[PDB]
């Protein structure tokens, strides 16, 4: 079994990459695509709070993302891994570190301590980082304001810091290239890991 | 201002004590009494998830108690402390430490790290611990309102003892084995000595 997470800001081609890689992996592996809360009842209710929430305190929001993460991990991810599945998970711990920790200003290590409580040692076996420049990412967003532009840059800066410190499970894919190549590089990286 | 929390297992008479003590304190201090979620909408919606939980994972439950704690602290406690009020809170971080950490088995230090993210340095100035023996506690439950319930009750008490041993300075342990009139009086007097020394 394998627990593979996908990380990157918006405009990184993440949705296209997961769907295309899923279609290629299904030939050889029992594979699933998922994202938090991913249909888990408690997680869905938490997501309703987050999405109905107005001016929510950033720490409360971080704790809700971590609570939906745990529900999705315990009721979806772990049973799938137990079945021998390759789990392709859209966003996990690193999204909270880059968005809540870095971009929102809580502190990466403070958001890490929170998410280590939530995942309780269950780190991904492999994490694909779709390394897009802010400029290409910004262009893909308009295809698919000032505060939004700067928040997007801060998210990327956050991801740079996370990938700088930890580089074992992390595999950076050049997401500035056309999506066909981003898909191919992501596919080859996954196969190399799975076949090892 | 002062942030005073109230802790204890069920059967310690905690609700009864806090109500009576608050009623006496209102006569001399600008004081509010609250508990989580305490009407804060997001906290109330979180409370509904906790209660609707079917064999909920203990870590998710702990994070929901901590998110409810943040909302209640941010919207009710901190603004009252900024207005110079005395804030009496029925259950706070130590309830998570004792129930989720010790009795549920997540570990006190792990639940403490979660709750330190939630409270962001805002520990109580004083914590009243209603120190009821497991035997008096057991009997009081049967009068106010099995083997598994008794064991969890003993574990909650053992947990609070562990927390108090490691952080004695913040706590004031009140004999909760004595009649409720006496528990109220000792709790009220402990709070007065603290309030008149600030
Ligand atoms: C997983 C995750 C995502 N995000 C971001 C990722 C980029 C998009 N934003 C906004 C957004 C967009 C859509 C939804 C949406 O799902 O409609 C959404 O709600 C949730 C997404 C995941 C979990 C939860 Cl509890 C809510 C959301 F916050 C969330 C974080 O800030 N932190 C995390 O840990
Ligand atoms: C504050 C707190 C309380 N408890 C216990 C205290 C003893 C009673 N139980 C059960 C209980 C009883 C009533 C309610 C109730 O409020 O009806 C309740 O729901 C909540 C109480 C506080 C916060 C939240 Cl999110 C839910 C509850 F869990 C919870 C914990 O285990 N951890 C904590 O952090």
């Amino acid at each position: 079994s394998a627990f593979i997470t996908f990380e990157g800001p918006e405009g990184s081609g993440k949705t296209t990459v997961i769907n295309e890689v899923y279609h290629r992996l299904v030939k050889d592996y029992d594979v699933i695509m998922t994202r938090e809360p991913g249909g888990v009842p408690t997680g869905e209710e938490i997501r309703k709070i987050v999405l109905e929430g107005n001016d929510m305190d950033i720490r409360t929001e971080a704790m809700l993302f971590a609570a939906s993460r745990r529900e999705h991990l315990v009721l979806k991810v772990i049973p799938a891994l137990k079945e021998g599945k390759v789990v392709l998970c859209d966003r996990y711990i690193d999204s909270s570190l880059a968005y809540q920790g870095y971009a929102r200003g809580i502190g990466v290590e403070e958001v890490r301590a929170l998410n280590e409580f939530a995942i309780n040692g269950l780190y991904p076996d492999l994490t694909i980082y779709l390394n897009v420049s802010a400029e290409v990412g910004r262009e893909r967003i308009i295809k698919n304001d000032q505060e939004d532009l700067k928040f997007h840059e801060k998210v990327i800066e956050g991801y740079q810091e996370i990938i700088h410190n930890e580089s074992q499970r992390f595999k950076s894919v050049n997401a500035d290239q056309p999506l066909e190549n981003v898909v191919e590089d992501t596919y080859q990286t996954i196969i190399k890991y799975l076949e090892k």
Side-chain angles (χ1 to χ4, degrees), chain A residues 146-164:
Chain A
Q146 213 59 53
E147 291 174 16
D148 298 319
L149 288 169
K150 184 57 73 184
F151 184 83
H152 183 249
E153 292 167 18
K154 237 174 136 64
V155 165
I156 296 160
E157 283 191 69
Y159 277 122
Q160 288 159 20
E161 193 202 280
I162 297 144
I163 275 98
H164 255 243

Side-chain angles (χ1 to χ4, degrees), chain A residues 13-21 144 179 183:
Chain A
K14 193 162 44 53
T15 304
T16 297
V17 172
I18 303 163
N19 287 108
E20 294 251 58
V21 168
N144 200 83
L179 295 186
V183 167

Side-chain angles (χ1 to χ4, degrees), chain A residues 18-147:
Chain A
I18 303 163
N19 287 108
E20 294 251 58
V21 168
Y22 164 82
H23 277 108
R24 294 183 190 185
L25 289 174
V26 71
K27 302 183 193 172
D28 302 300
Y29 307 96
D30 184 8
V31 63
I32 62 156
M33 291 186 278
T34 193
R35 76 162 83 96
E36 296 150 345
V40 172
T42 294
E44 288 295 330
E45 295 298 313
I46 294 162
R47 173 183 177 265
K48 285 180 207 177
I49 300 179
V50 170
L51 297 185
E52 284 165 43
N54 298 105
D55 295 297
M56 192 183 292
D57 181 276
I58 55 178
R59 282 171 185 258
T60 304
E61 185 172 72
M63 291 184 277
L64 294 176
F65 276 123
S68 140
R69 176 147 305 127
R70 176 116 191 123
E71 287 298 280
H72 174 263
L73 181 67
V74 166
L75 288 162
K76 206 172 176 188
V77 178
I78 291 169
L81 294 171
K82 283 170 169 182
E83 285 174 0
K85 280 164 163 60
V86 172
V87 175
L88 310 175
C89 178
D90 187 354
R91 300 195 177 283
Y92 190 60
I93 184 174
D94 306 303
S95 280
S96 276
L97 308 182
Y99 286 76
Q100 278 66 56
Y102 198 99
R104 291 292 193 207
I106 300 168
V108 172
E109 290 307 291
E110 273 217 71
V111 178
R112 194 182 281 276
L114 165 64
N115 282 274
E116 280 186 347
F117 178 90
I119 72 169
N120 192 31
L122 223 170
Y123 263 94
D125 295 311
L126 192 65
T127 297
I128 296 303
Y129 179 59
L130 294 180
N131 185 202
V132 74
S133 62
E135 298 93 347
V136 174
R138 177 235 306 140
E139 287 306 322
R140 291 212 186 97
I141 289 161
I142 312 152
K143 186 183 83 190
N144 200 83
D145 61 72
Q146 213 59 53
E147 291 174 16

Side-chain angles (χ1 to χ4, degrees), chain A residues 3-9 12 14 17 94 124-132 159-160 162-165 167-175 177 182-194:
Chain A
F3 176 34
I4 302 172
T5 67
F6 292 80
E7 294 290 355
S12 62
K14 193 162 44 53
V17 172
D94 306 303
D125 295 311
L126 192 65
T127 297
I128 296 303
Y129 179 59
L130 294 180
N131 185 202
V132 74
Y159 277 122
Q160 288 159 20
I162 297 144
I163 275 98
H164 255 243
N165 284 41
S167 294
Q168 291 176 90
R169 77 192 151 90
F170 279 106
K171 259 74 173 68
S172 179
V173 174
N174 179 336
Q177 62 198 319
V182 184
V183 167
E184 189 61 36
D185 296 10
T186 303
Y187 177 76
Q188 297 299 331
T189 304
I190 293 171
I191 287 300
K192 281 169 187 177
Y193 173 79
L194 292 179

